[PDB]
Design a protein around this ligand. Structure first.
Ligand SMILES: *[C@@]1(=O)[C]N(C(=O)[C]([C][C]([C])[C])[N]C(=O)O[C]C2=[C][C]=[C][C]=[C]2)[C][C]1[N]C(=O)[C]([C][C]([C])[C])[N]C(=O)O[C]C1=[C][C]=[C][C]=[C]1
Length: 215
């Protein structure tokens, strides 16, 4: 198995988007998972559409939040999700206007990972790639993160409130961390990324709501 892994230095990760004043982090979490899969599936790295997900997933609440699994299942039942080109992100909820001709990919179900199990999660990243994970990002230390392996004892493992993407895992100055792709902009944290703590007793509840799509 691998100690360090980074799907960024493998071309599996698209540019850091920026959700804006819309609680669509789930849409952005799902999309980034598929994106890494597609790149592995066909070798093509294109930006999938969070907006197709926001508008079209009736099980989710749009900007009011949603679950990645519902978003994955949707892409399966509808046999496809558009690209950003065919479906730009307005950052606001609107009626579903999905275009078949814009379809960039689809998925045949999803796999969920045992709750709290970071090893399973690490194994997922090593084999598959970017996996959608939900975490507690309320802590203002998170909102002011800039450098280093994040860790705060206040973080509540059951206060899952922000969906993000796991694009890797590794180590730094003795600290085994996770590499997280965030959807708050290129100007948040380190170039839109956070090196959250790993192993540290399921820090922030990272391994409780993770799932990747089957392509
Ligand atoms: C995120 O944007 C969307 N959210 C969700 O999708 C969550 C998913 C959890 C699994 C993590 N929704 C949810 O759990 O319930 C919704 C639901 C489910 C089923 C049916 C209907 C509805 C949460 C959203 N993120 C946030 O609220 C976070 C919270 C943190 C600040 C603590 N805010 C955020 O991301 O925005 C701040 C920001 C915005 C722009 C620039 C910088 C910061």
């Amino acid at each position: 198995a691998p100690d360090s892994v980074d799907y960024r230095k493998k071309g599996y990760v698209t540019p850091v988007k920026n959700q804006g004043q819309c609680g669509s982090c789930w849409a952005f979490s799902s999309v980034g998972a598929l994106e890494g899969q597609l790149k592995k599936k066909t070798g093509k790295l294109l930006n999938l559409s969070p907006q197709n997900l926001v508008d079209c997933v009736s099980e989710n609440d749009g900007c009011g939040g949603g679950y990645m699994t519902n978003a994955f299942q949707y892409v399966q039942k509808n046999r496809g999700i558009d690209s950003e080109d065919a479906y730009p992100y307005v950052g606001q909820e609107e009626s579903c206007m999905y275009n078949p001709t814009g379809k960039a990919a689809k998925c045949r179900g999803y796999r969920e990972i045992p709750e709290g199990n970071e090893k399973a999660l690490k194994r997922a990243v090593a084999r598959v790639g970017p996996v959608s994970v939900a975490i507690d990002a309320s802590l203002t230390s998170f909102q002011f993160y800039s450098k280093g392996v994040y860790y705060d004892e206040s973080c509540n493992s059951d206060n899952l409130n922000h969906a993000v993407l796991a694009v890797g895992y590794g180590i730094q100055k003795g600290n085994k961390h996770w590499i997280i792709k965030n959807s708050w902009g290129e100007n948040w944290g380190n170039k839109g990324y956070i090196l959250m703590a790993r192993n540290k007793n399921n820090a922030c509840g990272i391994a409780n709501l993770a799932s990747f799509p089957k392509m």
